[PDB]
Amino acid sequence: ELPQMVQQLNSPDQQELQSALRKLSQIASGGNEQIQKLIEAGALSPLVKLLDDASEEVIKNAVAAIANIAAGNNEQIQKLIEAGALSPLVKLLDDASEEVIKNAVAAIANIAAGNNEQIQKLIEAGALSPLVKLLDDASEEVIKNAVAAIANIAAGNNEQIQKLIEAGALSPLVKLLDDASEEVIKNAVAAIANIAAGNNEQIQKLEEAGAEPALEKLQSSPNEEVQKNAQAALEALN
């Protein structure tokens, strides 16, 4: 059932390979107990190997599956990192297909939701500069996943918030506080609230970027998430 599908990942047939990757992604999307079955079946290393495959269609399916595996628990994210997912995922952020960037950034966003040591490996893999460049991408689905990843990295320690500021994240995030999608503002205000939870120097850099006037408008939002995040970030500035 499952080992046969994992064995199918080593196939010259491009239809059989795409089909096996589609089924595995569907299992992986069903929750942590399903992701555990794929790990125990040895699905991770061949899946990671398929991120550098000669077939653009095979890459798409492999990234879709890994994005779903990345949605697992800290232990599952750890196995994905140990399988070598980070380096190929970072390389995929600079790819022609918008479909691969979307899931490459989603997988990275789900890994960024893990512990601070896992955020450190994402930074060590060079994920920050390409993530900041995707904040101007002009594809709304890419920008929301890029903002969500950054928001997750900002939930890390003060040193990790520092690597975000040094990457040039502050100015694109304050720009995304308005004249953008509803889901983008929601993610931008969460990232800003996370940077405001940093040290006093980082709170200062946020003012310099022009965050305070952009947050004052969001303070009275009817959206519970936006409202509380704009309120928490403003309390931190003053």
Side-chain angles (χ1 to χ4, degrees):
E1 204 78 62
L2 235 184
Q4 286 284 87
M5 209 168 284
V6 174
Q7 211 52 40
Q8 272 179 71
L9 300 174
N10 312 89
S11 176
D13 286 67
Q14 300 299 285
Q15 305 281 255
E16 194 197 73
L17 180 52
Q18 277 183 56
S19 188
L21 285 159
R22 234 164 42 243
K23 294 162 184 175
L24 292 168
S25 181
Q26 209 74 267
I27 294 147
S29 60
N32 289 3
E33 276 158 46
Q34 294 284 87
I35 300 161
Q36 199 52 243
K37 282 171 190 167
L38 303 193
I39 293 161
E40 289 166 341
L44 262 52
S45 292
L47 264 163
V48 162
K49 200 87 173 72
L50 292 160
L51 296 173
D52 194 56
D53 191 69
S55 178
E56 193 193 312
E57 293 312 312
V58 163
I59 295 174
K60 283 166 195 168
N61 286 13
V63 208
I66 275 145
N68 283 132
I69 295 147
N73 55 47
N74 283 9
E75 275 197 39
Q76 292 172 317
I77 290 159
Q78 201 44 42
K79 289 280 152 69
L80 189 64
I81 292 167
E82 286 162 15
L86 261 44
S87 208
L89 283 171
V90 173
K91 200 187 127 181
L92 290 173
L93 301 164
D94 303 296
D95 197 279
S97 177
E98 290 289 309
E99 177 84 308
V100 288
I101 324 150
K102 269 145 207 180
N103 285 121
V105 64
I108 285 158
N110 294 329
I111 293 153
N115 60 50
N116 295 3
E117 286 184 83
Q118 292 170 339
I119 290 174
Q120 196 52 49
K121 284 146 194 157
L122 218 56
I123 296 163
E124 284 170 7
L128 265 46
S129 281
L131 280 164
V132 172
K133 283 182 267 150
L134 293 172
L135 298 172
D136 313 84
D137 197 62
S139 177
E140 280 303 320
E141 211 191 278
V142 158
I143 294 158
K144 59 169 179 274
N145 286 326
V147 191
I150 288 154
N152 287 346
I153 299 151
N157 60 50
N158 292 348
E159 179 202 286
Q160 297 165 338
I161 292 166
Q162 197 51 28
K163 279 281 182 179
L164 272 177
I165 294 151
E166 288 179 343
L170 293 209
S171 287
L173 298 171
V174 300
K175 196 156 93 175
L176 295 164
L177 284 177
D178 71 92
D179 215 340
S181 186
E182 236 187 62
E183 280 283 292
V184 165
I185 298 159
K186 189 183 277 181
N187 284 343
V189 80
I192 292 292
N194 289 353
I195 291 149
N199 66 53
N200 285 349
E201 178 195 31
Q202 301 163 341
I203 290 160
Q204 250 176 74
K205 290 236 84 72
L206 221 47
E207 284 166 72
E208 290 171 6
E212 190 155 357
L215 291 165
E216 297 268 38
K217 300 172 182 182
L218 305 175
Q219 208 272 334
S220 58
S221 174
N223 185 291
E224 191 254 26
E225 291 189 287
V226 174
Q227 200 286 307
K228 297 212 101 189
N229 276 321
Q231 202 197 328
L234 284 159
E235 285 167 292
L237 299 162
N238 48 58

